[PDB]
């Protein structure tokens, strides 16, 4: 990152260059930038929705030879209608008199084109469907990169893994604009925007080690997401969904010490005729992450002790146990905050088995998932779970994401 020619970053509160070559930023009046993380941009279909690099003459690309790679995460929100089947846009364009690179998108496709002096094109591609119950790309943040080796293939990278190659060794002079438009270009959408982050253009093909590196070290590891990947945050509504049975959501049977928690029924279909068919997120019980032990912002760090709130028939609950209940398994309950008394409700948040229930002593009492107890699904702790995780790297019951209402999923909420 530090030898890149160009690295895009919010950064002592405006957007800049930090490479070496210190490269002007244009940005144009309706550029959002996400208040939680000012990394996060969002770009909507709007003309004053743009950001212009203008490169520094020494690394305009303009060659037969020079290897290049970029890399950048997005945000891409589900595509809702007919009108955006068959509409390629391009949202990073660096084309000029028909030669250059530029990224486009279409309905389910990332797009990479390269373009030599002659016209000719070469064009990589990611597909992704929506027809899918649970998506890993739909309005999730995916970390993309493309590589460029004149004499060999172009390169596209989806979280870290290789995705399509196509050669360009017949590919001649690539004389590429001195300008850099990230800009919706002829999309038909009025509501379609995009979110990028962490933009870099680097002068060689990366390589798959170097990929993996850069993926690992962008995702900020130490912080909780949210299955947007947007980073967890206290005191802010989360639907939740069990990754080892994602097809059940959450309920309470009853509030109270003699009721429980558990999974249950099947996610509604959300469906829009030839466009999306997915499972509904918007479903059960809402949790909410609270401060206990801790920082004085809002971001879930991992190892940070935390209080789970839980929402029934509009009002707030305690997620809690009785720590001395028969079995490794202990069920939760919804209480009554006020006279919580001494039952055990710490949990230990950390960055796919995300909470680990503590008793008031600082012991484990054990992730959170589920265990079956005469045909129902009940939530409860389990130091089984911690266990079995030193041991093996399969999926287990005490997988979650916390799901927010999103306007890039656009269900009701
Ligand atoms: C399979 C099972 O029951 N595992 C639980 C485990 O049980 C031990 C042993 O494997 C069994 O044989 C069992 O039976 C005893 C019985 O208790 C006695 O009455 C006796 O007379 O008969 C048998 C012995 O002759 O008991 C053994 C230990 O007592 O015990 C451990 C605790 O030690 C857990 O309870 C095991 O159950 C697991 O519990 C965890 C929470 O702790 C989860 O609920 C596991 O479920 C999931 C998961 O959350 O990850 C999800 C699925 O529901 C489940 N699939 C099933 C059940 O079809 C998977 C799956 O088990 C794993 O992925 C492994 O492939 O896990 C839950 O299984």
Same mark, same amino acid.
């Given at each position: ?145 493309? $590589?460029? %080796?004149?004499?060999?293939? /172009?390169?596209? #990278?989806?979280?870290?893994?290789? =995705?399509?190659? +196509?050669?360009? &060794? *017949? ?100 469906? $829009?005729? %030839?466009?999306?068919?997915? /499972?509904?997120? #918007?479903?059960?019980?809402?949790? =909410?992450?609270? +401060?206990?032990? &801790? *920082? ?118």
């Amino acid at each position: 990152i530090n030898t890149s020619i160009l690295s895009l970053r919010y950064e002592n509160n405006h957007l800049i260059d930090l490479s070496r070559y210190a490269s002007k930023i244009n940005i144009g009046s309706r550029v959002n930038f996400d208040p939680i993380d000012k990394n996060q941009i969002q770009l909507f279909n709007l003309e004053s929705s743009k950001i212009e690099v203008i490169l520094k003459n020494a690394i305009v690309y303009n060659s037969m030879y020079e290897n290049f790679s970029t890399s950048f995460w997005i945000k891409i929100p589900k595509y809702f209608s007919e009108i955006s089947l068959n509409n390629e846009y391009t949202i990073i364009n660096c084309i000029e008199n028909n030669s250059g690179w530029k990224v486009s998108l279409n309905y389910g496709e990332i797009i990479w084109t390269l373009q030599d002096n002659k016209q000719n094109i070469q064009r990589v591609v990611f597909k992704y469907s929506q027809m899918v119950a649970i998506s890993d790309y739909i309005n999730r943040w995916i970390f993309i990169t493309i $590589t460029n %080796n004149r004499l060999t293939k /172009s390169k596209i #990278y989806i979280n870290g893994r290789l =995705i399509d190659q +196509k050669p360009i &060794s *017949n590919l001649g002079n690539i004389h590429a604009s001195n300008k850099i438009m990230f800009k919706l270009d002829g999309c038909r959408d009025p509501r379609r925007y995009i979110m990028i982050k962490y933009f870099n253009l680097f002068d060689k093909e990366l390589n798959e080690k170097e990929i993996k590196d850069l993926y690992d070290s962008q995702s900020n590891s130490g912080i909780l997401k949210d299955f947007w990947g947007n980073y967890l945050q206290y005191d802010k509504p989360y639907y939740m969904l069990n990754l080892f049975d994602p097809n059940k959501y959450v309920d309470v049977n009853n509030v109270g010490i003699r009721g429980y928690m558990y999974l249950k029924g099947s996610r509604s279909t959300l469906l $829009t005729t %030839n466009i999306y068919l997915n /499972s509904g997120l #918007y479903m059960g019980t809402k949790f =909410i992450i609270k +401060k206990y032990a &801790s *920082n004085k912002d809002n971001i879930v760090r991992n190892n940070d002790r935390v209080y789970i709130n839980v929402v029934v028939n509009n009002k707030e609950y305690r997620l809690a146990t009785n720590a001395s209940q028969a079995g490794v398994e202990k069920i939760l309950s919804a209480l009554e905050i006020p006279d919580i008394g001494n039952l055990s409700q710490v949990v230990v948040m950390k960055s796919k088995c995300k909470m680990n229930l503590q008793d008031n002593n600082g012991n484990d009492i054990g992730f959170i998932g589920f265990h079956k107890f005469n045909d129902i699904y009940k939530l409860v702790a389990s130091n089984w779970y911690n266990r079995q995780i030193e041991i093996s790297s399969r999926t287990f019951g005490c997988s979650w994401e916390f799901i927010p209402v999103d306007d890039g999923w656009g269900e009701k909420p």
